[PDB]
Amino acid sequence: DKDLLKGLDQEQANEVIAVLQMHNIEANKIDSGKLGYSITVAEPDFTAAVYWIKTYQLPPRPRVEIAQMFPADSLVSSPRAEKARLYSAIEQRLEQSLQTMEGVLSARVHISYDIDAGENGRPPKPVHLSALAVYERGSPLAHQISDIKRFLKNSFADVDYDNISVVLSERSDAQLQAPGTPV
Amino acid sequence: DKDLLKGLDQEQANEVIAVLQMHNIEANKIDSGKLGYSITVAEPDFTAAVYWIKTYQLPPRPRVEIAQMFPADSLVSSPRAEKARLYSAIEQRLEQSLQTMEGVLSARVHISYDIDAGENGRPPKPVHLSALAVYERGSPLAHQISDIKRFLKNSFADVDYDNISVVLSERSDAQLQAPGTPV
Amino acid sequence: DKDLLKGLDQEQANEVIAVLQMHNIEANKIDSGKLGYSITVAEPDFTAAVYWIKTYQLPPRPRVEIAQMFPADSLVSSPRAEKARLYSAIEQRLEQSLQTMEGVLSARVHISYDIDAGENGRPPKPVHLSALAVYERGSPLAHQISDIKRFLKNSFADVDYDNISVVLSERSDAQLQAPGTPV
Amino acid sequence: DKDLLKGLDQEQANEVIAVLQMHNIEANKIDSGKLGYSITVAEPDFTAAVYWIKTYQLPPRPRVEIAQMFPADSLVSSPRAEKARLYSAIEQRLEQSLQTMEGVLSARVHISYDIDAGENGRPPKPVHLSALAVYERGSPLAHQISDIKRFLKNSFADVDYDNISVVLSERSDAQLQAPGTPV
Amino acid sequence: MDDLVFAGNKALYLVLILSGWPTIVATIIGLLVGLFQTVTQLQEQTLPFGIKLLGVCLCLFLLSGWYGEVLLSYGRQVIFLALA
Amino acid sequence: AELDSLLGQEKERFQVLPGRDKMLYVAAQNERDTLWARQVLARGDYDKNARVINENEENKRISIWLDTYYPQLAYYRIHFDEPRKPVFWLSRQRNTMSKKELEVLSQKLRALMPYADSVNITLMDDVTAAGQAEAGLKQQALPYSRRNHKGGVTFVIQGALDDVEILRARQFVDSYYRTWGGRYVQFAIELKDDWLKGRSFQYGAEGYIKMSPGHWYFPS
Amino acid sequence: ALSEIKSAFKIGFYLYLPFVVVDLVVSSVLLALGMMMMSPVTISTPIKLVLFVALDGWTLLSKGLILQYMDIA
Amino acid sequence: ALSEIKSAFKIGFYLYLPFVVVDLVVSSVLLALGMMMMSPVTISTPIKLVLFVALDGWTLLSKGLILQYMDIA
Numbered sequence A, B, C, D: 001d002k003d004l005l006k007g008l009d010q011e012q013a014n015e016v017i018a019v020l021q022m023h024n025i026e027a028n029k030i031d032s033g034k035l036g037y038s039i040t041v042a043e044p045d046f047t048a049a050v051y052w053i054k055t056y057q058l059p060p061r062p063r064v065e066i067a068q069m070f071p072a073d074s075l076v077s078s079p080r081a082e083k084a085r086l087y088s089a090i091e092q093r094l095e096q097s098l099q100t101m102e103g104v105l106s107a108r109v110h111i112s113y114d115i116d117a118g119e120n121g122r123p124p125k126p127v128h129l130s131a132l133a134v135y136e137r138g139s140p141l142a143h144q145i146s147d148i149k150r151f152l153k154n155s156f157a158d159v160d161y162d163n164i165s166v167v168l169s170e171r172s173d174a175q176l177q178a179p180g181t182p183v
Numbered sequence E: 001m002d003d004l005v006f007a008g009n010k011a012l013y014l015v016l017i018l019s020g021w022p023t024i025v026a027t028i029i030g031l032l033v034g035l036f037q038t039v040t041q042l043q044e045q046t047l048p049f050g051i052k053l054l055g056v057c058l059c060l061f062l063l064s065g066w067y068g069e070v071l072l073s074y075g076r077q078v079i080f081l082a083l084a
Numbered sequence F: 001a002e003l004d005s006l007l008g009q010e011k012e013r014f015q016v017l018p019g020r021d022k023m024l025y026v027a028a029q030n031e032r033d034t035l036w037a038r039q040v041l042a043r044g045d046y047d048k049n050a051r052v053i054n055e056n057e058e059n060k061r062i063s064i065w066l067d068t069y070y071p072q073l074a075y076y077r078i079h080f081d082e083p084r085k086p087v088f089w090l091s092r093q094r095n096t097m098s099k100k101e102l103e104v105l106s107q108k109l110r111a112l113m114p115y116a117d118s119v120n121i122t123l124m125d126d127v128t129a130a131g132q133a134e135a136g137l138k139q140q141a142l143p144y145s146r147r148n149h150k151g152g153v154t155f156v157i158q159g160a161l162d163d164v165e166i167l168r169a170r171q172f173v174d175s176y177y178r179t180w181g182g183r184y185v186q187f188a189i190e191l192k193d194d195w196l197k198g199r200s201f202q203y204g205a206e207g208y209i210k211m212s213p214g215h216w217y218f219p220s
Numbered sequence G, H: 001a002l003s004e005i006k007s008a009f010k011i012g013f014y015l016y017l018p019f020v021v022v023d024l025v026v027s028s029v030l031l032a033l034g035m036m037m038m039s040p041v042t043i044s045t046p047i048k049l050v051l052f053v054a055l056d057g058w059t060l061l062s063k064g065l066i067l068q069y070m071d072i073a
């Protein structure tokens, strides 16, 4: 067996395994504890596994949130930093709320950070919002975008339906059968 | 066997393997632990391997992000630095959201940093955005540019469809068969 | 055997080897560890190897980036240093993005540094960009310049197609056959 | 055998050997380690070797770059010094970029240093650039000057084709055959 | 606001650093010269009073050649913020 | 140990020809290959006499000889697609020779090229050459001016050309030159700054430019 | 009138900061040398003057104040 | 006017230095004698006065100022 990757996290290993199984590559996960997880494949499949690893740029990054740039554990804060943390937490609370709607599997939300200017000496600009979501098969996407827009509109002091973008997509086919083992 | 490279890390090694395999060069990866990975090839292929290493300028660089120029470790930092970190985080969060759309394999985003001026005594300029993305084979690119533009437009206070550039490309052919071993 | 060069880096040595092989000179790379790499050739080829080493001014330099002149270990940074680091990070992130386009092998980018004055009491000046890139064989260069210009234009607050220079070239013939050994 | 030079470095030694071989003088390079390299020739050739060492003023003293006068590593800096380092870094990065164009073997670039006035209060003055480059044999020099001018014009905020000087030359004949040993 | 907040923090910080090194170095000197009395009385610092007296002027002169540049940078910065 | 065995694995890259001077001639396609070959001889891997040749070198050498013995002959280029029977293109209008004279010329060229068995002299039309040049520039949509002289034509292409234009012009000129050479038709390419950007002006028979309000410029 | 007065005090605030820095540093160095009894005003004042002339504060103030109202190119 | 003021400060700067020196000398002597609990100003102001008057500082100063603008002869 040839070594593809070492020292992965749990949530990196499971993503890699998923992506390889989708392409009919049988892989094995081994745990070394403090050294993390290791992924191995057979030689006949080595070439393909390499090419897919490059094509998807595995293993994945950690997930960025703007609050990480302005830690609460810091000796000083400008008002800009506080305002940034505030917005960065509102975003995550909306993302966590949409996932409780009927049929939604996962979602992501973005807010216009007008704070990149102070709004000093000038009237503030209106808010803009964007949302992505994924639905179960057999859902009326057209009839579901109305609900999302309605819900988002009242979460802020001044938002127009024109300023809300919503993109929906369906789940891909399920990978239920196991890959074949090399002869 | 002749040594091409020493002391690589994991993500450099896997790229070098992928590139050499694509050109029909069978290569071997060896792990020395604290000393990193080593790459070796046969003599008949040595010349070609050298020429390709030159042509692609391998091993690849580490990836650059603007937040690396303005470390949040600093005890006091000017409003310019903070504004830069803010923008350099939004860029990454956008890239990570686009990678969840249907069919996208990878993406990149760039934003106009007006912070090249403080906009002192002057109105702030409008935002401009550029994005690159790679799709699965058999995707109607013309029909998919619209979605991206729609999604990006609302992530900022003031953006016009005219100011958003989008470039799309398809994945190359898959490398599934293994290279032949020198006779 | 005669010693040409000693104490090379890995990325110098591979470039020398590439250049000598191109001219039909068989060379050898030796590793001394803390002492680096050594390059050797046969006597019949010594004269030629010397002439080419001079003509290409080998071994190559380290590559230069503006951020090296303004290291962030500072008690105080003027506006000038911060703005310089900023632009010197953008230049690199643009080159790294262009290498992902279809068929590009390598590229370089340049930005007009207005930062050589603070604009102190002076109106700001518009930005100019230059780019160089190398393509795979059989590429319609004329049709591909448009894509690059379009992509760069929206990466900045104010750029005119008139102010963007782009130069493209094709890769040379591949060096696959090994050089002959002196009789 | 008579000693010509002692305590050379690697680049000075290879330069001397190159110049002597061109005039049919067989020379020997010896390594004494911490004492550097030594160059020796036969008595019948001693006179000629002396005359050429004088005529070319060998060994070559090392390359000068303006940043060496205002070394960045210091406790202190002043606007003039910062501005100087900046320009002396742009010069080097441009030369390194031109050497990547097709056919160019080496090039040199010069910029008008306006920093010898502070440009504070006094209005700043437009930029002038000069370039030298050497090409491979069989290159249409006339048709290649245009590309260089086009590329350089956009690297700065304000440059006119009238203010850019470009001088090109071809590589000399190759020295491939070895010199004859004295009888 | 955030400009006033920045310039005030930057002031307190500059005081902390510029007053740091001299008192640390003086502590190290005073310690080692107090300790090595454990071997020899070490008159040649403090016995030649004219040389100790010159030392202060030398120190002050040299130090000003490292700090004035810093203060000039800070001054330009605050004036820029105040007027632009 | 034949010479072909020493040039490499890729056999068909080179072509070995014996010469009446009792010397081997190696025909190359470009500079890079030329130096790849010259290295073998300069190293001394072969024991008999040999020489390396290419089309540009031979055109130059023959033109230098013509300069001395036929200082008024009007001609284009010598093609070596078939190295045993080169083709020499002469002007139909500007030359005046008898058949005997042409044959003599042929024989003297054959004496300069000991690897060729015969030289074919073909007469070409200048109007054809010039027309193909002008048609190519129109096809590429370049701006140009044409000037005619007794023995040559010059095309001036100058202005504020764009990157696309520079690239297409360069490619075209490189293609034409390889066919006809540079003796009859010359191309001059020049970049100049745009005086006219952002200024109002009158164009016509009586043009002028307003450098600003209150300032008139009358070029002529 | 009121807004102008306010904006003036604001400027004065920034002008004070570097001299406050000087005034503190000089005292701390005199204490490090033990000359605890000497009044530091006698040394801090000339430093302040040196700093102001090397900074050329009059030119900067006179220019920037006008730039806030005029537009000059 | 803005250039005259700056010149004045330039001049006065160089006149402060010697008095500073004298203050440091006095303080260092009091410490070296251990006659600690006496304020040095009481001692050094008489010394500064007597020294400057005994050298006619005011006369040299007046000449040095006028010779920028006239020849006295």
Ligand SMILES: CCCCCCCCCCCC[N+](C)(C)[O-]
Binding pocket: E004, E005, E006, E007, E008, E009, E011, E012, G020
């Ligand atoms: C006893 C030393 C006092 C030093 C005072 C320096 C001025 C500090 C002004 C406040 C600065 C902090 N700020 C703006 C957040 O309030």
